[PDB]
Every structure is written in C-alpha cells, then in structure tokens.
Amino acid sequence: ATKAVCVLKGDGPVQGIINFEQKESNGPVKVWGSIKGVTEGLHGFHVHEFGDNTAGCTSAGPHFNPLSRKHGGPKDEERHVGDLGNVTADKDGVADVSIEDSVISLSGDHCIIGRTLVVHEKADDLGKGGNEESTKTGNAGSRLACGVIGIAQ
Amino acid sequence: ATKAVCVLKGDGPVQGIINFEQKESNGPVKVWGSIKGVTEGLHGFHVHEFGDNTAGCTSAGPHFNPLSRKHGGPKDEERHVGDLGNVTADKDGVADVSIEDSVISLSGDHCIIGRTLVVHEKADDLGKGGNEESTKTGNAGSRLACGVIGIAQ
Ligand SMILES: COc1ccc(C)cc1N
Ligand SMILES: COc1ccc(C)cc1N
Ligand SMILES: [Cu+2]
Ligand SMILES: [Cu+2]
Ligand SMILES: [Zn+2]
Ligand SMILES: [Zn+2]
C-alpha cells in the first residue's frame, strides 16, 4: 500500500492527525483520524492546491482542482478533486474522521501528496447552497487548521 | 518550472523557510532561504524519507535513500539522495541558504515533494569523520527543526 499522513495545526489549539491508505493506485483512498478543538457541528474538509504554509493556511490557495470543475460534495460527479465534504465534531470538540474516497489518489495526476489538507470554520454546503460561492468554496468560511500531506511509512 | 517550499519548525526557537525551484525535469534544483535561531557553525541539512511529523521530526525516519547508498556530502558520488550537506550560521544565529543540487528532484523517482527537510544540532561530517555513524547520519545529531516539503505556486 501507499500511505500518507497529515498533522493539522491551528489556533485553539486545533490539532489533528489524518491518515491516508491506498492499496492500489487504481483504488480508493481510506482517510481516517481525529481532529480536536473545533466547535460542535460540521466543518468543511478539503485538499487545497499548494503545500505552502509560509503565511499560514491562506498560502495553500484554492481547493485542489486539476480538472477545472465546480465545487461539490464527495458524492457528486461535479466536484473538485479536493472535495472531501465535512467532518462533524461533537460537544467535546472532537471530529472522528472515517472517509473512503475514489477521486483523490496518492499517485498519478490526482495525487494529493505535498498539498495542504484544511479544516474550515463552517459547514461545506456541498455546492447545494444558495449562491455562487457555494460552487467555489461551499461557504465553509475561514481556515481553522491545516498541514501538508506527507508520504508515510 | 516546478516549485516547492518548506516551513521549518521545532520544539525550540529554530525557524526557517526554504524554497525549491527546478526549471527542467531532470535539471538542477535551486534551494534557497533562511534559518534563524541556531548556534553559530555548521548544521546538517537533509531530506528525510517520510513526510510524517506525527510525533515531531523523529517521525521523518532516516535520510531519503532510494538508491541504497551510504551517507556522504552533496558533492560526492556516494551519497544519499537527501544529502544536502550543511548550512552555516553566523553569530546572529542565522543561516542563509543558497544551494544548487542535481541529485534531488521535484519530479520522478528522486522526488522530494512530501518528504521532510531537517536541520540538525551539529555539523554533518559529509561521511569523512571516520566512525561508522559518519557513513549513515554523518554525526549531525538531534533534529532541531523540520517541515514537510510542499508543492508551491
Ligand atoms: C476510512 O476507514 C478506515 C480505514 C483504516 C483504518 C485503520 C481506520 C479507518 N477508519
Ligand atoms: C533563486 O535564488 C535566490 C533568490 C533570492 C535569494 C534571497 C537567494 C537566492 N539564492
Ligand atoms: Cu478547504
Ligand atoms: Cu537529517
Ligand atoms: Zn471544492
Ligand atoms: Zn545521508
């Protein structure tokens, strides 16, 4: 298997460890881990284009979108490659993450290694919201924590 | 023209930003930036195998060494891919880095994107120190600061 890891850090503290595993390069990626320090409810969760955290999470740029599509949920055909939907945290501020995704990859042109994983202030409307912003960012608001996705042993 | 960046941080006061640029696939990579908060003198400077920072810089594992070579200096034929020698800090504790390397790459099987850059406590003896640890780690000692190498705009 190919494996990757991301350490998310932001003010709070928001702290997370997210694991990625892809048994075959034509197969889906299992994404799992825990994020603590966030508000109860949904928080947008995406892979962003650049693995640049020089000025913080803002340096990561837009959602990873190699196919030039509009924003969506992980279930939509019309989505960015980076669109991983929402993580949901409880009252204790903890979001337990267990995702399987068929569109991200840990090799080839959809590869997310060396790009930034970001957890957001607010819910991602999965592009089903009211406005145009829904179709770009899903109205998920500010970036609470991020880290660069690295190759793991 | 491929670009990458790394933000170095540790448990102490050691901070850096290092930029990478490769104009041509299989051309040389220009490595530049600044590191502050280190002692005056030489500090080992290497790409390590994993971009895993779960338990800090220790999680990065050994020097990146896909060709199974012994440790050396960047000017040696016998070197690890990750062997970038030393950065030298002044009395202000600041190390200005300007390197060109043709062994590292930002694409292909020598690719460093998603791996960890590490700045060390002590000098790298470039494998010529004449103990056995010269030929593995170069005796550069603890890891002062590190970060995952990310894709830049
Ligand atoms: C996303 O699913 C998973 C895959 C593998 C492991 C170890 C945990 C989870 N939740
Ligand atoms: C591209 O190379 C460089 C650019 C800017 C500075 C300050 C140093 C180097 N080496
Ligand atoms: Cu995002
Ligand atoms: Cu090292
Ligand atoms: Zn998106
Ligand atoms: Zn080495």
Swiss-Prot record, chains A, B:
Changing C6S: Enhances formation of fibrillar aggregates in the absence of bound zinc. Changing G93R: In ALS1; 30% of wild-type activity. Zn(2+) binds at H63, H71, H80, D83. It comes from the Eukaryota. Its EC number is 1.15.1.1. Belongs to the Cu-Zn superoxide dismutase family. This is Superoxide dismutase [Cu-Zn]. It comes from Homo sapiens. The lineage of its organism: Eukaryota, Metazoa, Chordata, Craniata, Vertebrata.
